[PDB]
From a paper:
[name], a member of the conserved TMEM16 family, plays a central role in the initiation of blood coagulation and the fusion of trophoblasts. The protein mediates passive ion and lipid transport in response to an increase in intracellular [name]+. The protein is inactive under resting conditions and becomes activated in response to an increase of the intracellular [name]+ concentration. Fungal TMEM16 structures have defined the general architecture of the family, where subunits, consisting of an N-terminal cytoplasmic domain followed by a membrane-inserted part composed of ten transmembrane helices (α1-10), assemble as homodimers.
Residue numbers in the entry:
A (entry chain B): 43 to 81, 89 to 119, 121 to 149, 202 to 220, 233 to 414, 446 to 475, 517 to 640, 645 to 791, ...
B (entry chain A): 43 to 81, 87 to 149, 187 to 196, 202 to 223, 228 to 427, 445 to 488, 503 to 587, 591 to 640, ...
Write the structure that this text describes.
């Protein structure tokens, strides 16, 4: 309990390149602790380190320290004796199969438990440079020792290298080598990829149906018509800087809009609601299956309430700040710095809210960081969907909020097409660059570390010369995948190829994550986690919000409801001039005229052009009406249809989700049978 | 395992009229088994053989029994049942009961007469089920269902109204009858722990739930009375109601006839008296109360969860779940494909009975249509017709309910549930679905379908001539139907629950079935049955559905339910203590499927209330007229004002009816009649078609539904998130118990 002596067996030997055992070779290496002490502060750190090392030795562990061949840095190898392993396996209730005994991953986990109970505080307080486990060997080369398997080499050769992209994930193998946390993360990623493949095939079918019915959408032909679409002069969008422009320049946008906006897309939106429900339920089943297989289950005011609401206000205070930043912007290098900016501020809030428990801190930081990223990523999409062009008024008296003038109307192509373009960008290009940066940054850091020259190097030095995966390693990966899932599900009513883009991205993502974790990053201590954690409630909330968001997208930001309404009610004799239902004349009977009579509350139109009547895209009465520029029966019918569609789709989808969740058992039948059999035989 | 010795110390004695102990009095009585064997076709011999076998097996299991001959019926024989202390302890080890210990709570055996009589009866019943008699034959339930044993039951302390003769015997039944279960104790606190100890955890949790329901109904009723008084005080400033009452304005409103024949154009004056009380019924006070009830439902559910967790800690409702024994009917007949086919057929039959009650509702509609004319020929006639229709629908539903109870028993018997709990759940879902449809179909039809599809006076909707509603809205009719159904069901159900057991006991006494012992006294009583408090839970859940689903009609429904529950606790406790035979205590950590049912009803209630306010209420039309149709672009008034509402909303109709008959000309001599819809007035370029006002009102209704649903669901989510389902004090007590043990 005091600094009686130092670490025994203090000898230096680095001749064996891959000696995961001690100098004697009898016992392997469970951990390595890196420090530097040969050169007030120095002597105090020496005293504290010697005291802690004496405590560790007195507790029963076997440690010995060797200085680096390449001086002032010393590594201590750590191995737990058989008796210590047995007693702490009895303490920590590990499920060994009773019919080299302990797998190296769980050996390292137990040793880390010992270090925590008697480590991170010293590491944080400049005492120990590092503390880590060791890999089998170099990933691309076999282990020199034959007794010790090169499980890492096999994992890299058949699962981590890109040449093994198509091969199935050795999930049991990666669980064994890395730990239950990484295992369940990759299992969830693979199951997500499978369900993405299913939904992407269905969405491709719907997209191709719309593609086949390309020249059968009459409004696009009317758009591309040099007469019907050429004699339509849409009013200028901005004051004195935008010109009166004809709809002819929107024919390509019209074709893409026929592809992206059709009853096929509506069917895919409904199917995507159903598929989200199925995804959640079958992930529950698969997670229960993994709980059975991997034995994931293990065990080990008023003043505060004012403080609770104190930070929540600050959290809400910062959220609206980053809202305006994106809106004013409407940028990758700023985004990455934004995250550590988010990290720093979320740390501060957690600091004032810390119950000092690691899991509680994780939950709080998860919620805060997810809110920050959610806003920073989906603010532009939400604006384009719901707030862009909806509050504009009309050419007479356009809505001026303040000295800031002329809240923008929609683009010539359409708000839905712009949203689809933004989704495609953030989905493909920025995700690809995220993967490229994610795979290059650790490799570049390792390259510069080697270039600093900091010949055969032993295993501890080899692993030390690597980037240490810091706190909350898999958290960023989960955040990335959850953002991708939010893009897939929240906005799937825009274009149906989002699951296909996510499918390609995930096929690359599994390989890039595995490759970087295997090669570029120092190995972490294996842990256990029966579920993905707070990400499960986050996904459930995203799923619930997805129904509302998709229904609102279809009703408000998509013109499908106005087109359906025109077909079913404004082609009949009382409103239309056709004997039966049709869609011709849709543009001429939906676009609203406007004579040039502007309030003097400037008149940019006279300076912009020499015309008299321009046709803007809203549903008001035409000029000359007894209540001109006012809303009309057609506008109120369209708004009624939008609201009714929202209500009907919301209620039907929610009831279907309830029925599916009720009629699909949470736990698989085979899982029940195997659990019952093992309980019977055990 | 064979019949060798039976009926130990067989002696006849009844001189001690109030004694729950044996003839010697050393050991008490945990149970009584009733049979009769002395008096065909060899079946009596077979039953004697089997019963002797079972008795010998029971005695070999170590129980102690004492059989007496009935003092009245020679054939009737009672057998008193007690378990020795060693057997009690070993079976407590078998099923790990939690007992006090030095007052901490611990497992099968503690360090601390000790066995409460309820626990003794529960343990003895467990033994009786486990022990075999004999192919393999299971236990007591098979014999009882087979008619071998006539009965098997526990015993009360004494007569409810009289103290026990034995001074050493505590009269907990007498105490529960004095300070509870009696009208003079209607307004006093419930000895919940005492009634739990006497009757069981299931009975205790039911009564706790009922008391807590009354507690929350008190708050809901207070807020409802506040809003109702707001509406009643604002009665004099109801501009639309006053404008209707005005003979100068309302007297010029000649509404078109409702029925095709023999109904005159009627003025709106006769609707003034209904409108005065209608203004209280659909006003911003009722809207605020509807929102408050949307919040209060979530508060009720969350606080009941907290109270239930507290009771789980205190009463140790979590007991080890031994494997449930099969039902005798299921085991009598023992592929799975045929059983699934039978289940599908049973579901088809249930849907058939649901269709039958739907047809009954349609018949009620036809009766309303056929009786409105005669009411008009002979207190407005439509109000009288609505009241009579409510009365007749209530009577018909009550009559059909008992028949459905019987047929649901038969259906669940025909289908095969493997265990008693599965039988309970299947019967729960089936019975609740039928009760839901039967009790809420009329209210749903009146709220959402009555008058919503009528068309205009030209070309009305025929099926024929679906019901049309009143200009003030059908909220008054919904309120009348709701109050009538609710109060009538309460009164009729309490009258049944009191008289039926009491009447059965009285006729049993009249058939001569004077000093009598405890076992005979309790035998001459009505058995509870294997179901138990299922029906009371069902009744209270139906009342909760009435309170929450239709709370947007009138705010005093919680007050009516409050009075009803105050009476309900007393009637149920009184009947259970006096009228009915004591029921074997059980364990139940929750109310069961009724809590998922309540959660589903709560989720449905937001939609139902929002749709009620938007469609069946006129509040949204009044608000829209005020805020958008007094203004110059639509109206004439310079500022926002409600006046002109009636003259501006009701749509005119010139007499041009299609010949697809024209009864209006035969039934009257008038030219322009005003009906309650927003279609275009005649002479409009698109006349008798929907108008911009109509679509504006529809848009307002839909937007209000969307906003209310989303906001209220968000509030409920935030409240459920902010309110922990486990009490802080309960968690602290759990931590203290864990630390001590
Ligand atoms: Ca990525
Ligand atoms: Ca990644
Ligand atoms: Ca399920
Ligand atoms: Ca009642
Ligand atoms: Ca009752
Ligand atoms: Ca809650």
């Amino acid at each position: 309990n005091q600094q009686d002596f130092r670490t025994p067996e203090f000898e230096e030997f680095n001749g064996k390149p891959d000696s995961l055992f001690f100098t004697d070779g009898q016992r392997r290496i469970d951990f390595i602790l890196v420090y530097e002490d040969e050169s007030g502060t120095n002597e105090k750190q020496k005293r504290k380190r010697q005291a802690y090392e004496s405590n560790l030795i007195c507790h029963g562990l076997q440690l010995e320290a060797t200085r680096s061949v390449s001086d002032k840095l010393v590594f201590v190898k750590v191995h737990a004796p058989w008796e210590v392993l047995c007693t702490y396996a009895e303490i920590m209730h590990i499920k060994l199969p009773l019919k080299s005994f302990f797998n190296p991953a769980t050996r390292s986990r137990i040793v880390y438990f010992i270090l925590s109970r008697v480590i991170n505080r010293l590491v944080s307080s400049g005492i120990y440079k590092a503390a880590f486990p060791l890999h089998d060997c170099r990933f691309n080369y076999e282990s020199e020792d034959i007794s010790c398997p090169s499980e890492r080499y096999l994992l890299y050769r058949e699962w981590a290298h890109p040449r093994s992209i198509y091969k199935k994930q050795p999930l049991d193998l990666i669980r064994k080598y890395y730990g239950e946390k990484i295992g369940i993360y990759f299992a969830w990623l693979g199951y997500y990829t499978q369900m993405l493949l299913l939904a992407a095939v269905v969405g491709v079918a719907c997209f191709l149906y719309g593609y086949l019915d390309q020249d059968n959408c009459t409004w696009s032909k009317e758009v591309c018509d040099p007469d019907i679409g050429g004699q339509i002069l849409m009013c200028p969008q901005c004051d004195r800087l935008c010109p009166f422009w004809r709809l002819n320049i929107t024919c390509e946008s019209s074709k893409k809009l026929c592809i992206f906006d059709s009853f096929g897309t509506l069917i895919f939106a409904v199917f995507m609601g159903v598929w989200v429900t199925l995804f959640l339920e079958f992930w529950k089943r698969r997670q229960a299956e993994l709980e059975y297989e991997w034995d994931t289950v293990e065990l080990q005011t008023c003043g505060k309430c004012i403080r609770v609401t104190l930070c929540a206000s600050a959290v809400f205070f910062w959220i609206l700040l980053i809202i305006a930043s994106v809106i004013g912007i409407i940028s990758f290098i700023i985004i990455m710095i934004l995250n550590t900016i988010y990290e720093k501020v979320a740390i501060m809030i957690t600091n004032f809210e810390l119950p000092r428990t690691q899991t509680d801190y994780e939950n709080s930081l998860t919620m805060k960081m997810f809110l920050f990223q959610f806003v920073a990523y989906y603010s532009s999409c939400f604006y384009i969907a719901f707030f862009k062009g909806k509050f504009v008024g009309y050419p007479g008296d356009p809505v001026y909020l303040l000295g800031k003038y002329r809240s923008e109307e929609c683009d010539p192509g359409g708000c839905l097409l712009e949203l689809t373009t933004q989704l495609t960008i953030i989905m493909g290009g920025k995700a690809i660059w995220n993967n490229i940066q994610e795979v290059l940054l650790p490799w570049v850091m390792n390259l510069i570390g080697r270039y600093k020259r900091v010949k055969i190097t032993p295993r501890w030095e080899q692993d030390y010369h690597l980037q240490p995966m810091g706190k909350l390693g898999l958290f960023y990966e989960y955040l990335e995948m959850i953002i991708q899932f939010g893009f897939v599900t929240l906005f799937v009513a825009s274009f149906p190829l989002a699951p296909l883009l996510a499918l390609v991205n995930n096929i690359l993502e599994i390989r890039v994550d595995a490759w970087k974790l295997t090669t570029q990053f120092r190995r972490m201590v294996p842990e256990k986690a029966q579920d993905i954690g707070a990400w499960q409630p986050i996904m459930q909330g995203i799923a619930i919000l997805a129904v509302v968001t998709n229904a609102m997208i279809i009703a408000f930001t998509s013109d499908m409801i106005p087109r359906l309404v025109y077909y079913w009610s404004f082609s009949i004799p009382p409103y239309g001039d056709h004997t039966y239902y049709t869609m011709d004349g849709y543009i001429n009977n939906t676009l609203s005229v406007f004579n040039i009579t502007d309030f003097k509350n400037e008149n940019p139109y006279i300076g912009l052009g020499n015309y008299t009547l321009c046709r803007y895209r809203d549903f008001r009465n035409p000029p000359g009406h007894p209540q001109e520029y006012k809303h009309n029966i057609y506008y109120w019918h369209v708004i009624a249809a939008k609201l009714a569609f929202i209500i009907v789709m919301e209620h039907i989808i929610y009831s279907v989700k309830f029925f599916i969740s009720y009629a699909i058992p949470d736990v698989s039948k085979i899982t029940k049978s195997k659990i019952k059999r093992e309980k019977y035989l055990t």
